[PDB]
Symmetry: C2
Subunit: 224 residues, 2 copies
Amino acid sequence: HHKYTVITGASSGIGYETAKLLAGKGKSLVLVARRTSELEKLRDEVKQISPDSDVILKSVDLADNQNVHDLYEGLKELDIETWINNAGFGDFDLVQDIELGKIEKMLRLNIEALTILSSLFVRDHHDIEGTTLVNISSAGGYRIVPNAVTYCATKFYVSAYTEGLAQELQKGGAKLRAKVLAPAAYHTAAEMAGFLHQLIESDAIVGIVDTYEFELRGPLFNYA
Amino acid sequence: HKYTVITGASSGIGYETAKLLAGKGKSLVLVARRTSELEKLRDEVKQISPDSDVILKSVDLADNQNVHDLYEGLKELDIETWINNAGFGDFDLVQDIELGKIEKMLRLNIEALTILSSLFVRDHHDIEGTTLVNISSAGGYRIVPNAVTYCATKFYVSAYTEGLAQELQKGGAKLRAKVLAPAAYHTAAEMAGFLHQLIESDAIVGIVDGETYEFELRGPLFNYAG
């Protein structure tokens, strides 16, 4: 019956506070994370904030590509105004010291899931008015951080991918808007959720934290 | 025997690099999906250089475990240069993408490259005369319309390799990491020569100027913190 905002990585940080912020505006939510327990506590808070919001919970491990497909297929019929790819995590270590099981999971979450779901959403929504895709990158996706080479690399992917998707849509007159948030790698999750809201409401492709000042602006990378 | 290891060996820069390094008497490990193509390249390498030793590894590097198996199977061999040339591109709007192709692209361009880079760096950072080369693209520094996803994989490769290269330099490592960025000269034979030139230089980046014009040995293009 409603319009929905889909949030992956909903159980923690930016995703948690964004779900809370959007409920405060009477929005309905699809909340995606691995831990049913975190999802259900967030849902309790959200219905406390906005009892008329509809809350759909999806317990899924997005590091498995088939789960990712299943998730999207299971939401295809919903009216979705906003999709937010916030799943993912980082790492601090020299390359020679990396734990490969972690870094492989990171690639599957930060890159594969984000790409699969971005691609499916765009497929179905590029010509639908009022729709927005937001991918969560990092300031480290625009400036490499020592001891976080691999994490930064995934965020250069997210930033270049989303900047390119955003301009491909804009320059071809699509109705869907794509945007990338680059938090520093303002401190609190709740403040980050406000920046995300700022970005969605904005004309800007990029909302990036430097100064630790938040800036709304256009693509950082060269485009041909 | 002192080996040079080449993924995507049966294609493009990998194929001409194998022949160039055969011309200089080098032994090779050649990694590609199709045994048929690997055996053809070996015979050409042996034609050029009969005393080159050539080990062939038929493997689908789009499976993460296969990537580990490949590396384990070569683990104790003596490798002076590792070249990650596996992968491929795509032209299509994001709305038009074939997902299976894109997902394989990510597993090959990014995952295989990252796992093998990581494993090589782990066992060789301390070893003199060693070089890791990752084959990226001019589209890994400038986004090309209609190849958004491909370009994003190559931004990954470029950022990863630049990051890793400066990390090894700051840490006083003997291993050197380098990235090659051909456009999106022109022949694969010339690119192999440019690559050899990159391996010998001090430069982290060998890039073909994307407007036009030829090869440039240079430092990192991306922003780096300290």
